[PDB]
Design an enzyme around this catalytic site. Structure first.
Site, mmCIF file in Angstrom:
data_model
loop_
_atom_site.group_PDB
_atom_site.id
_atom_site.type_symbol
_atom_site.label_atom_id
_atom_site.label_comp_id
_atom_site.label_asym_id
_atom_site.label_seq_id
_atom_site.Cartn_x
_atom_site.Cartn_y
_atom_site.Cartn_z
ATOM 1 N N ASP A 115 0.839 -1.283 -0.062
ATOM 2 C CA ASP A 115 0.081 -0.089 0.030
ATOM 3 C C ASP A 115 0.739 1.306 0.065
ATOM 4 O O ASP A 115 0.503 2.181 0.760
ATOM 5 C CB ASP A 115 -0.952 0.042 1.173
ATOM 6 N N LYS A 117 0.780 4.331 -1.226
ATOM 7 C CA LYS A 117 0.224 5.368 -1.740
ATOM 8 C C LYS A 117 -0.141 6.588 -1.173
ATOM 9 O O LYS A 117 0.055 6.669 0.014
ATOM 10 C CB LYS A 117 -1.353 4.588 -2.453
ATOM 11 C CG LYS A 117 -2.312 4.294 -1.168
ATOM 12 C CD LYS A 117 -3.605 3.881 -1.964
ATOM 13 C CE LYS A 117 -4.539 3.195 -0.866
ATOM 14 N NZ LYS A 117 -5.972 3.638 -1.196
ATOM 15 N N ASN A 120 -1.532 7.226 1.824
ATOM 16 C CA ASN A 120 -1.145 6.421 3.174
ATOM 17 C C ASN A 120 0.099 7.238 3.890
ATOM 18 O O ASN A 120 0.589 6.670 4.626
ATOM 19 C CB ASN A 120 -0.745 5.082 2.825
ATOM 20 C CG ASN A 120 -1.864 4.126 3.035
ATOM 21 O OD1 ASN A 120 -2.999 4.531 3.617
ATOM 22 N ND2 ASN A 120 -1.810 2.966 2.424
#
Length: 261
Positions: A115, A117, A120
């Site tokens: 994750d 991204k 995040n």
């Protein structure tokens, strides 16, 4: 530890298997993010790193799984990119450098984050990046073979560095419907202003074939670390948090409830 030790504040997010809320320990007055997972609807433990949010407590109720985690005080890196529109290749170099540091640690432990991204990435009080576990630009091998190799983290890195330096996603100018074919069969284009070293970084991090991709070779992060784009970086320094953050969040302490809104 139990629910009785925390005071509710606000909702942070709500996934399929659960929800995340901003709380505050009662005996400490410090802020946390509690992840509550629907047991029936259905790690984090020992992997510690300066740029990853640590797990404070972990308890289960009768039908829930709760994860009380440290929550950074700067804004969300998305908020900060909005305002500035686009970051200086140096400011992005900083962030991308902290993330690369964390990705090396995790990969050296056989962990694929999956994750990396923009949504995040948060900033802490002093302005250092903090990776949280709270159009989706999934990697090509994930869209074709559902393959979650370590290579997908570098691809996540690449999409983030592209947005941070270009001020927009690689296909912001083409309807979400056709995102699947684009990522899989559309070559990515770069702005002219971008430096020669920058385009090279993105070109390698956003390569469709995971074995070709930067970071995709056997020596993992070394390829990324020793890229011309990262010549000015002191790797042993970033991990120690010796570099001066290129932007200071503007919070008094780690309780300055500001940025929560």
């Amino acid at each position: 530890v139990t629910m009785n030790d925390f005071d509710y504040l606000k909702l942070l997010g709500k996934g399929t298997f659960g929800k995340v809320i901003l709380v505050r320990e009662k005996a400490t007055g410090r802020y946390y993010a509690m992840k509550i997972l629907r047991k029936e609807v259905i790690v984090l433990q020992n992997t510690r790193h300066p740029f990853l949010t640590a797990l404070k407590y972990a308890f289960q109720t009768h039908d829930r799984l709760c994860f009380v985690m440290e929550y950074a005080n700067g804004g969300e890196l998305f908020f900060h990119l909005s305002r500035e529109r686009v970051f200086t290749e140096e400011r992005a170099r900083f962030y991308g450098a902290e993330i690369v540091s964390a990705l090396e640690y995790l990969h050296s432990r056989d962990v694929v984050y999956r994750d990396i991204k923009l949504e995040n990435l948060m900033l802490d009080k002093d302005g250092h990046i903090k990776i949280t576990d709270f159009p989706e630009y999934l990697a090509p091998e994930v869209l074709e073979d559902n393959d979650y190799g370590r290579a997908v983290d570098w691809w996540g890195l690449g999409v983030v560095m592209y947005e941070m330096m270009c001020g927009r996603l690689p296909f912001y100018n083409q309807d979400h419907e056709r995102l699947f074919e684009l990522i899989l069969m559309e070559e990515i284009r770069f702005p002219r202003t971008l430096s020669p070293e920058a385009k090279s970084l993105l070109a390698g991090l956003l390569k469709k074939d995971p074995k070709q991709r930067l970071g995709g070779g056997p020596s993992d992060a070394k390829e990324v670390m020793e890229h011309r784009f990262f010549l000015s970086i002191n790797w042993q320094d970033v991990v120690q948090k010796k570099l001066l953050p290129p932007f200071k969040p503007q919070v008094t302490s780690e309780v300055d409830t500001r940025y929560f809104d």
